[PDB]
Design a protein around this nucleic acid. Structure first.
Lengths: 238, 230
RNA sequence: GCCCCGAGGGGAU
C-alpha cells in the first residue's frame, strides 16, 4: 500500500548526473532486487535537483517490497560518500521536510477533494515514446495514460471503463505555459518543462476523484519515458 | 493564375483594431463587391495595423481594388482609424505570391513556426490550444488543398500528420477574448519529420510558406492563428 | 538513432 519518495540531501559541487544516479540506484538492487532491471514497468522513479551547493537526489518507490528492501540501505548511507556521477556526501535521507519528499498509500491517493481540473507542474524535461521517436508535447492522453497505467500496474484498484475512457479520450487542455529543454542523455531529444492545466468536461464526481488521484500519484511516479534517469519529475498544483 | 495575397493596412489612430470590428468591416466589403480569406491585426497601440489574406484569385481581383480605394480614408475596426497605406510588401506581414511558388523549397525535414496570435483548434465540440503537429499540419494541408492546384499523395499526408514530431517548443496560452472558455497558443514550435522523403519535405516546407497567408486553426476570420515560418 | 517488450514502455555510474 505504501508509496514513498525519499530525498537525499547532498554535499559536494555540481548536480547528480542521470546515468550516475541510475547506476548508483541499480547498484543497490542487483543484490536484493535483480529482477527490476528487466521489468517493462518500473516500480520506481529517480530524480534530482537544486541549485549549486544545495543539490539533492530522490528515490521514489511504488511497491512495498522495494521500500522494505531499499529504505534501510538508503538510511545507512547517511554521512557517507556516494557517487551519482560525481561524488557527494549524503547529509540526510528525508521522508519529510523537503518539497519532493513524501510518503502515502494507494487508497490515500483517492481521498480528494475531487476536481474536474488538474494543474500539473513538470519540473524536469518530460517526453514520451511513439514509434521509437521521442515526443515532448504533454498531451492529455499521453500524460494521463502514463500515470494511469502505472497506478494500476502497482496499485490495488483499476478504474471503471467509463472513468477511463473519460480520462483518456475526453480530458482536454485548458492552459499551457513552458518550454522544452534538451535531454542530455538522449539523441535529438528534448522534454517539456512548465505548467499545464488539464480539464475533464462533464466530469462525474468519480471521474474527478480519479483525475485528482492520478495527479497525486504523479508526485511519486513521474510522467512519461525514462523516469529512471530523472526525467518527467512532476507534481500537482492549484 | 493562382495568386495569393496578404495585404496590410497600416493605421493612423490610437488603440488597436478589435476582432469583431475588423471582421464586420471585411464582411461589409464582401457584400458590396473553408474561408478563402483570413484576417489579422497587430502592432503597438498607436502604431497598429490590420491585414487581409486573400487565398483565391477571384477574391483578390474583387477586394484589392476596394482596399486600395480606402487609402487615406477613415474606417472603423472597433476604434476609428485612418488607413495610411495598403501594402503588399515593405511590411513584415504583407506579401504576394502564387501557389506554385509555395513549393519553391528548399525542402526540409524541419519547420519552425511562430504563432503570433492565439492559436487553437475545434476538437470534439471544444477549443483545444495545444499546437500538435497533426492539428497544425492538417489545418494547413486542408486549406492548401482547398484553394491550391495540388493535393498531397495519401502517404505524404500520412507521414506529415502521424510522423511529424516536435523538436522544440516555447510559449504559452493566452485568452481568446471573443470566445467563451477558450485560450490559444502563442510562441514558437519547431516541427521535425524524421526520414522525410524529398516529396514529404517539400510538402512540409510548402505548408510552412502557406501558413503566412492562411493562418492556423480555428477562427482565423477573427485574427486568431496568425503564424509564419522562421 | 540502436536492442528488447508490447497505445506506449524498459535499457545496471
Amino acid at each position: 500500500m505504501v508509496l514513498a519518495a525519499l530525498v537525499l540531501v547532498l554535499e559536494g559541487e555540481g548536480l547528480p548526473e542521470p546515468l550516475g544516479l541510475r547506476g548508483f540506484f541499480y547498484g543497490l538492487l542487483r543484490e536484493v532486487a535483480p529482477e527490476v532491471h528487466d521489468q517493462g514497468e518500473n516500480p520506481f522513479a529517480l530524480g534530482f535537483g537544486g541549485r549549486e551547493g544545495a543539490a539533492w537526489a530522490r528515490v521514489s518507490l511504488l511497491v512495498e517490497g522495494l521500500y522494505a528492501r531499499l529504505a534501510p540501505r538508503l538510511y545507512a548511507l547517511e554521512g557517507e560518500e556516494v557517487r551519482l556521477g560525481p561524488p557527494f556526501r549524503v547529509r540526510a535521507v528525508l521522508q519529510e521536510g523537503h518539497p519532493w519528499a513524501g510518503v502515502s498509500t494507494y487508497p490515500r491517493l483517492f481521498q480528494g477533494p475531487p476536481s474536474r481540473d488538474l494543474a500539473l507542474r513538470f519540473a524536469s524535461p518530460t517526453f514520451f515514446r511513439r514509434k521509437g521517436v521521442h515526443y515532448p508535447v504533454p498531451e492529455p492522453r499521453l500524460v494521463l495514460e502514463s500515470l494511469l497505467r502505472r497506478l494500476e500496474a502497482f496499485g490495488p484498484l483499476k478504474a471503471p471503463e467509463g472513468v477511463r475512457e473519460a480520462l483518456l479520450e475526453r480530458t482536454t487542455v485548458r492552459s499551457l505555459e513552458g518550454r522544452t529543454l534538451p535531454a542530455r542523455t538522449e539523441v535529438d531529444t528534448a522534454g517539456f518543462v512548465g505548467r499545464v492545466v488539464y480539464h475533464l468536461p462533464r466530469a462525474t464526481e468519480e471521474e474527478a476523484l480519479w483525475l485528482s488521484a492520478l495527479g497525486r500519484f504523479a508526485f511519486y511516479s513521474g510522467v512519461g519515458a525514462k523516469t529512471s534517469l530523472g526525467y518527467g519529475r512532476a507534481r500537482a498544483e492549484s
